[PDB]
Ligand binder design. Structure first.
Ligand SMILES: [Zn+2]
Ligand SMILES: [Zn+2]
Lengths: 275, 275
């Protein structure tokens, strides 16, 4: 087995559905995954579970919940309801956390403070149901470039502020793509450790040049992130969970055979990632 | 006159050289500019000065200095030397500040902490010459997406930390494109005010979607930034200097007649920008 490696299934999403991805992962000695809700829906929740169990599969996360801002309270309630259903799916599959991607500005608002208030309210509204189901909520801070239209939780400091306020049952998914640049990263990781808030660690690389804002994530080692440096900090902070490969690569990795992608992931994980 | 408006000449860089840009600005009632060092070099420093003086032109900034990291001390010294020459140009033209864009990772380094140390060292090395010439150094924090390859000063908090440490003669250029997303923006602006560190304010907009990482800045009002909200904070912090339009728009504004761009800038400034 490749111990301590997980594959977020977005990494081979062009190539595979849920059943085939799991098959390819188990064949390469990988026994931990993070599936997406649409992948689960395509195979069916009952079959997804059967597969999880038949291998006692570790799910490092379910992607994703969140998307809280909306112009009206009823739209915000509709989002809260979707998150409760997401929690239920995570529980059924035994996921280590439900990943939350906050949502950006609602409608045509320029009020980012208000959108952020909506996100905190939504997480607060979902948290009782998530605590009750045994599903930790992982706020994934997203890269600042995504603030307007994808997620207005944009720093680890901000995400940890929300955690500290709401209390137990909410933590952070630390994705290197989203946080590597942060000048206060070392402090916030140590802070997350002391709060016991680290729920997941996602890996990939920042390419130079980066050629697309969303779908040009690098394979570990092809970019400029000090991955080992970051992993060492995360472990020193007390998180020893699996490193989860999440690569969106429209023009490279999504065009290669899935077996080549997963094998490269094993190779890079051993050479570039371990702390 | 359009009081309180400045045009960073990058906004019409495809259309105009220095002499023609100034002509177009003065014709639309704009009497403040921020030229680039290559534009000054193309017209010649002596002629640039003659033009500045013939109108008593306000320069809200000179773009740019910085670019401090390099793999070797001699490369770092070469950068420091270039910055001293940049200071001299700013002095000669009577610029309100020399804008500093930090530089990204040197060579093939993954050590962003070290590159940041190099930037602080470089600013520290240039500062005596800049103090002596009467040229304030404006650290311009750049958007986090630029961290690897353009500038590893990426938050207003980080930039103000450097200012506070080095002391007098170094402040911040606050560009809305670079900082609008920052969850601690309100606090850091108030902080910059208390330190008396605000040297410039650059305006433009964040488009949704943004279609290019470098050259798809919006015209004020076409995007999602609360420009008036930010300007009000800057004024409450005690900076009442000109708002400087800096737009890099490869597929829109750089393809329009310069007169139409500058007229739109006046229109939006009056409608969308004033606090
Ligand atoms: Zn992630
Ligand atoms: Zn700027």
């Amino acid at each position: 087995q490749v111990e301590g490696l997980s594959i977020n299934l977005a990494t081979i999403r062009e190539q595979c559905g849920f059943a085939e991805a799991v098959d390819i992962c188990l064949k390469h000695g990988i026994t931990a995954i993070a599936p997406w809700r649409d992948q689960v829906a395509a195979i069916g929740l009952g079959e997804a579970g059967r597969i999880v169990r038949a291998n006692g599969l570790k799910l490092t996360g379910l992607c994703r919940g969140g998307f809280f801002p909306a112009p009206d309270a009823s739209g915000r309630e509709k989002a809260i309801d979707d998150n409760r259903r997401a929690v239920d799916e995570a529980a059924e599959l035994g996921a280590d956390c439900l990943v939350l991607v906050a949502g950006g500005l609602p409608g045509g608002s320029k009020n980012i403070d208000a959108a952020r208030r909506m996100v905190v309210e939504g997480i607060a509204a979902v948290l009782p149901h998530a605590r009750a189901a045994g599903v930790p909520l992982a706020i994934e801070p997203l890269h600042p470039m995504y603030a307007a239209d994808r997620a207005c939780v944009n720093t680890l400091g901000q995400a940890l502020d929300i955690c500290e306020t709401l209390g137990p049952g909410v933590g952070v998914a630390i994705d290197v793509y989203h946080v590597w640049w942060d000048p206060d990263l070392a402090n916030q990781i140590a802070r997350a450790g002391k709060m016991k808030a680290i729920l997941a660690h996602h890996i990939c690389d920042w390419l130079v040049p980066t050629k697309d804002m969303l779908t040009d994530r690098g394979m570990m080692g092809d970019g400029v992130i000090d991955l080992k440096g970051i992993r060492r900090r995360i472990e020193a902070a007390g998180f020893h969970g699996a490193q989860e490969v999440e690569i969106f690569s429209a023009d490279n990795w999504w065009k290669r055979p899935a077996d080549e992608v997963i094998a490269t992931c094993v190779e890079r994980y051993r050479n570039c990632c371990e702390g």
